[PDB]
Predict the structure.
Amino acid sequence: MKQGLQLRLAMTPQLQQAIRLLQLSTLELQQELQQALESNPLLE
Amino acid sequence: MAEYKDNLLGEANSFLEVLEQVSHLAPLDKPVLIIGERGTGKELIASRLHYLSSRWQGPFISLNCAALNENLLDSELFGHEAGAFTGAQKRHPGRFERADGGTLFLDELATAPMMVQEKLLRVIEYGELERVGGSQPLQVNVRLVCATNADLPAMVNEGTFRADLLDRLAFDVVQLPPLRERESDIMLMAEYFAIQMCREIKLPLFPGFTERARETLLNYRWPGNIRELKNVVERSVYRHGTSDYPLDDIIIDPFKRRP
Amino acid sequence: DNLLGEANSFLEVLEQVSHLAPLDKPVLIIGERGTGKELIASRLHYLSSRWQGPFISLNCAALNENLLDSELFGHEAGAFTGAQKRHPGRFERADGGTLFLDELATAPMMVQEKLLRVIEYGELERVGGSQPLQVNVRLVCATNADLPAMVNEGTFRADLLDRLAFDVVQLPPLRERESDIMLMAEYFAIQMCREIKLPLFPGFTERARETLLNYRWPGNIRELKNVVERSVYRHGTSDYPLDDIIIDPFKRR
Amino acid sequence: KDNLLGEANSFLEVLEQVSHLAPLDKPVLIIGERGTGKELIASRLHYLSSRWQGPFISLNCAALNENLLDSELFGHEAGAFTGAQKRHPGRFERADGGTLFLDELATAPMMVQEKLLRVIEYGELERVGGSQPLQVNVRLVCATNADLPAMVNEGTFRADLLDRLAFDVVQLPPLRERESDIMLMAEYFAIQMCREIKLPLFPGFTERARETLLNYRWPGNIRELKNVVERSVYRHGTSDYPLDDIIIDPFKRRP
Amino acid sequence: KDNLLGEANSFLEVLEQVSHLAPLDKPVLIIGERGTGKELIASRLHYLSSRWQGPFISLNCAALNENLLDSELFGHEAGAFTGAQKRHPGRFERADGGTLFLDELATAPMMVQEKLLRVIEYGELERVGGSQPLQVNVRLVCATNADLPAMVNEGTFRADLLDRLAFDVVQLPPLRERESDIMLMAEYFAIQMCREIKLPLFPGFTERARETLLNYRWPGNIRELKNVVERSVYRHGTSDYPLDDIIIDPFKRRP
Amino acid sequence: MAEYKDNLLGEANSFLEVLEQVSHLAPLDKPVLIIGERGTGKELIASRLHYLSSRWQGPFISLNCAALNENLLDSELFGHEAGAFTGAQKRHPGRFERADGGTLFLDELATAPMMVQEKLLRVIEYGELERVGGSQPLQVNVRLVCATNADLPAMVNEGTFRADLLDRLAFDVVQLPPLRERESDIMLMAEYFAIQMCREIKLPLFPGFTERARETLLNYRWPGNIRELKNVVERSVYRHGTSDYPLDDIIIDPFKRRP
Amino acid sequence: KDNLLGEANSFLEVLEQVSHLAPLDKPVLIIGERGTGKELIASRLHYLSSRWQGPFISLNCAALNENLLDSELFGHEAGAFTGAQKRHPGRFERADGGTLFLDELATAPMMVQEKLLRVIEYGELERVGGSQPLQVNVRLVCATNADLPAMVNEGTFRADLLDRLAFDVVQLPPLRERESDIMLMAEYFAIQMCREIKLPLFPGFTERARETLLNYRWPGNIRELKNVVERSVYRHGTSDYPLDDIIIDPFKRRP
């Protein structure tokens, strides 16, 4: 319209931890995945 | 199927024939243009078209060209997808984008935005609309309905309306009879309005229509086919009448100032 | 309830006020420049069956932000927390009562169609609030500064008001009578002796009082009150009768 | 590749010119009668253009807001204004290689004419406070009912706007100008419309009214003929109605 | 209170009217020349009113662009503002119980006039997200140089709005019309200029200078008085010799 | 060092001498003012100057007064550091702030905003720039270059151009020749354009310019110096031709509608 | 203090009056010829004023934007609107005691005139929704090429806008006017142009062309003379060129 404009969510916990593991390393992520799969009963 | 009309606001002289022709063209979804008194027999025309519209579940989209201002009208017309348009956020479904397959009930506001008229000529050019900053166009389908309140050819010759805008649309033009021209259902519509007013105001009985009141109503030009007549009926009802006086000195004209 | 100098024409005006206050039929009243026809609305509301109902009178001129739809239901869903404390719409706030409309002469075009639609069919939808509207509260319109000629001049819609207005209320100017304007001036003088704590007026001489009545009183009762206030301040005492009449504040010496 | 063109001598020559210029990404001009649908030929050429597999997004010049013209030709970088996020490519940047048919080009203002002259150059797109402009090559297309030389003589359009045009200004002959296969094309359009509106056909048919309307102005060179045909079909409301008492005069009041 | 110039009998009556307006908390209009300190006199009268120690609002009429009453006037102390939400004091809300002089109130917008009409009549301006419209205890004042009687007749403002906003409008006589404070204000200006510019003394208005001051039309009035102070400062020369020609024109080119 | 111009769209008669004088003034970094036909001989001259521009790595940031809207123009001109003017965020590098030490390439847009001209008067006053809401002004350096198309004195007398704008500017005048006047490299430029068209369009050979084509081009007014000839040549090439006719019935003027 | 002032009777009187009013911080108008370098003389006098060691920030009157009038004349409190942080004092508030040299005031708008009239008030820096205004005292100076009396007669200049300057208007003589140090200023300009053009000196020298150009209007009283001298020096292309065949005519097509 005019030279004017306007400005326009929130989450936490699980997705935060999921994103945190992404910040890790390659072999560290491999070890973390191996450890996580040790308890997972529906993972291959 | 068949959708019942909300009101029996029809004229015996030629409105029945007009309705018959409209039903003949009702199954067709082509560019349809109506004409009649602004706000009186034109809104009724749109409602009747919606009732006689083919199929169901069609979102009856109605808008006024005087509203939506000027700068923000384009965002609602073409749609809004890019950022900083309508507060950004999600792609704002524009007025044309909001109605997909529904009736686009036009209003004869005769908006001076002939630029908006040219843009709407593209809104119905091949059945598509592109949102603001839209990466790719979108072929949107929706029924088109128009009504008129003035002489479209006079506006085109005088330039008040774009000639190409008129040429593209209005596969047919339908003019509603003037209130001064029909003069058929005057008594019937008066009685129906009186009954409705009595029901709404819980009047114990319809006071009745006097011949002098009938003579004055016939003398009234009634510029508004469905509104000014309805206004006069509401004025007489609010003024009311005694049990003995069915309509003696019934106040048809409300605009008059008191003594 | 409210001091009033109802005349023959105002008798029919009060009859219409009763017929539209009690019966929830929509009303359209016309006042003068300084008529203050709002007092008649308050009297009718008390006379209406919704005297204990909500009494919200809106001056339809302070439209802020995008208003329009948001005025009838503040959505404000673009940003911020999302929960809106204030959100009582126009119909909701005065539901079960009277809906007085003021300063609608200089109303916008967008508001007009929505208001016309929101009365008959309602169905007001917005993010912050949504309701079918048409609260069946008696609809009241006044402060008609724009004449019906001005309304025909595109300032107002013809059909929408025509359907909406089942009745009208006329108000002759204070130049017509000037007696109730004298009675209203006496009432304002009592109110001044009360709040403004006026000890006693200077009094009035016949020539000055007639000249004040001879004045066209364009501002009606508002002009009368302002003129009385100007005379009292100019006299500033209750010593001698005010043998002169202040035509207008604008002057020099 | 769907317009009901008459394929007459003029129509075939125009189609050949469009196909020849379809591979060229240079800007082209469209003259003639608007409301008749020269834009359909433009869309056909854009599909037949070299950037056939390219995002083609036309635009109406009159559609852009005056104070939002900058946001129309570009995108807010969000490094300014109250608006946030943004960083959205403009319609041209949204296409960025397709065909942008300039609609309402004659409706472009002097400010719009100057903005087009600025866009006569290639790419160099700088957003709101942009660090560097971005160059994006896209094929250009324009249409205008009014005479660009007439506007330039009036000075309404900028000179560079006329200089922005590079390819031939394809001029559309009016309804009376060609009038070679308009009967056949209109009959095909009427048949298609009848099939769409569940109308089988017109048993009355006939072309005496059609032959007479061949000597008719038809200001809407193509759209007006179809609209009048649809109006006649609907008003007659019958199939066994020959081309008798049928004229192009929907606004006309009967006696 | 504050030192002020103008000691005429008409000036005494104007001061009497100012003090009377001080007793009346109702809104009033002070008519006179801008550039005379009318707002300062309004503030002094307010100090002489009941609110001897009260706030004062400059309340310039043409001081806001694209800002609402709930933006600065009523303010946005309450939350839930569009977009960003934060507290914002309102001058009308803050200056309640103080002084609210209107600066150049004749230079106000039509929408501004419409909002001011409701603010003056109802007395409950309210705020965006403000649950309580409340009341402002300040007394509305105004001091401008334009004539609303002409503006109102011109439709520049609403007649009923002005009538509600104006009750005891009084006009201060011009100093040029007065032509009496000229000697007093001239001596005061000479003393003030000698103090400020650290001059030895007031040179003295010679017979030519005194006649020039007396015969000067003084179009600026107190603005012309300030111009006279400036011109005397420019032509101060030596305090030893009287200013022979006090009156001079800066636009005039010497020799 | 020496950077060859991408194109040398100049006139043999005197644009060679004009280029020589430009090279003579090339070392200086003062206000360099070019002039000539708008859209034709103007930004080609700008590119030639940028090739002859002193030093290297200079941001030849080009701005057109038509763009930047109206309200947003000032913020992008002076830059913006404080919030609420550039939406806070980073200190917005303004259009002037974008090129530090670079050429300020001007276009003869003739900004109707005298406020824009007044801002530009302070732009080159002492070599300084302060951001919007900036607590401290910043002295900046940059080169200046412009091209012209209208009589700046005529507008200044008409008040269309501010006297102060021309007083601060217009240190030296460099007017490009009109097309109807040079008439020298017309054959050379025509041959270059024809060769370029044949190369780009993969034409087997240049059809050649007939004497009738050359005579028509000489008679052609050609309001645009360097582009109108280019556009006409493009239109003639688009019209195309067999190998038999070198330039018979060549459609140089595409504005002419067909029969 | 770097300007090569002509030191003419006009120039010397101007410098002397500037020094005399240099200690005074009151508003003043530097009248005469703009383009001729009022800004440089303004900087020299600011270095020569009472507060020589002060932050002086000048700007163009019409540099800013209309919607950002508040954001330019003040600082964004950031309490409202999408603006964040901010709380940055304006350039006038950035000087905070310095000289607010008014330049290009002739292009100021009516809103700009209202803002200047607000500035006529003593300080009073109130932001958007700010708590209370702040009174900040800074030196004021004005320069323009047009007659503010002419604008006020046209009504363009507000009465307060005319009264904004608190001193008599000091006019700058034109080149056709002063014409006194024309030889000296010409020699200094020729030396500077030769030094910039890497030319040690002009062996031709002489002032016959300079004398002929002395009998010229030279509307850009200093700007035009300097531009023309530089242009002639560049055009000669040889040092051994006397003041013959040299004139001021950049626009004219050379024969």
Q: What stands out?
A: The longest helix of chain C spans residues 180-196. Chains C and F do not touch (no CB pair under 8 Å). Residues 56 and 249 of chain C are 34 Å apart (CA to CA). DSSP finds ten helices and five strands in chain C.
